[PDB]
Ligand binder design. Structure first.
Ligand SMILES: O=C(O)Cc1ccc(O)c(Cl)c1
Ligand SMILES: O=C(O)Cc1ccc(O)c(Cl)c1
Lengths: 220, 219
């Protein structure tokens, strides 16, 4: 039931939707193919059976921004028109199941519990983006990066001896896109955290050596 | 079925939940009272029967930001813990109806259409805040104000002679809360639009005198 997310990746997965694929439409996408083409009117929820999708918004002038990444058991909630132009691409071989409104009605008639899993996925999304707007309007770029590391550590960090490890590949490019901070700032902040023996951001994991100092710095 | 919103006010209203408030819990709030107290854990959808609520987020340092305004038939979607500290206050005398998960099961067993109205309400919120993040990362403060005015005109400007009128009280304060732009920028932009005979943002209405020019300046 917990609908917090720290990064916009794998928002509240619903693995149980796999039990209802007969009620929807299976569609596959090779790496690089468009799951949602720019300008395409989507009126389906799109369940990712396995794979990976990058989901962006496109503005009227052609500029493009990351919204989120989605993996196995993720759900794209675009049942109705929203007024946003969306471009979603497969990052690897991807199988999806598309559920129209009518299809979903058959799902919920079979399994009431599915309604609430979907609410939990929408809610996780609203809480994520609503907080992010507010944080962007409150905290400077360096503080947003520190808050991100601190939060990630408290949500996903597992203590291995005298330290915490967060097992995820979080690229500097991805940090930039998620925080809306320019690359020199990202590199400099990450480089000082490593230098001062607080946190080392590696390719495959983040190691936090001093969580109280990271917290303390994030609060300045 | 349209799940757009230009301003964080009266997100996708659900009038038909009025039909089911006997399945929920009616709670009344006086003007100035906390509908959602700071620190309060909420596990109900909260339907606004009548009145008005200002709903804010509060950070660990006690700093606070507007998320939205809600009026009659609005829905607060806080059925599960989110990890955000939320503070919601009644701006007028307010009647609400609180729907637990259990109460919602009863609603949906009765009328399956309510499922989908709630989906529309959530989808409208996601689309609003996700777009706002991306725009904040795309467009400078002044262009975000212009875009706000042009999109409001396009969606609900009413033609009156050579003008378009947007009938709403939208304060300079609220313009800054919505756009994330500081007051001195908001005042200078509004004063320049008025100077240049493009747009006059008055107290209870906004008049657009040159739409094509506003369109152009926003781009
Ligand atoms: O389509 C939109 O405007 C925003 C959006 C994108 C992806 C999602 O999964 C949702 Cl719920 C909304
Ligand atoms: O509770 C939150 O973290 C965000 C929030 C606030 C109000 C709402 O109606 C929703 Cl759906 C979410």
């Amino acid at each position: 039931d917990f609908c917090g997310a720290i990064i916009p990746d794998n928002f509240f997965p619903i693995e149980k939707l796999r039990n209802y694929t007969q009620m929807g439409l299976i569609r596959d996408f090779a790496k690089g193919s468009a799951v949602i083409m720019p300008g395409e009117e989507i009126t389906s929820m799109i369940f990712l059976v396995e794979g990976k999708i990058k989901l962006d918004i496109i503005f009227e002038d052609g500029s493009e921004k990351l919204l989120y990444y989605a993996g196995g058991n993720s759900l794209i909630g675009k049942l109705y028109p929203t007024g946003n132009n969306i471009y979603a691409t497969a990052m690897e071989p991807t199988r999806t199941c598309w559920f129209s409104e009518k299809s979903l009605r058959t799902v919920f008639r079979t399994d009431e519990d599915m309604i609430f899993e979907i609410f939990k996925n929408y809610l996780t999304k609203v809480a994520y983006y609503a907080r992010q707007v507010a944080e962007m309007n409150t905290y400077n770029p360096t503080i947003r990066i520190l808050r991100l590391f601190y939060e990630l550590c408290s949500s996903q960090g597992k203590r291995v001896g005298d330290t915490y490890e967060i097992t995820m590949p979080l690229s500097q490019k991805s940090i930039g896109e998620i925080t809306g901070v320019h690359h020199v700032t990202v590199s400099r902040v990450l480089a000082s955290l490593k230098r001062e023996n607080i946190l080392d951001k590696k390719k495959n994991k983040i190691i936090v050596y001093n969580l109280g100092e990271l917290k303390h710095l994030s609060e300045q």
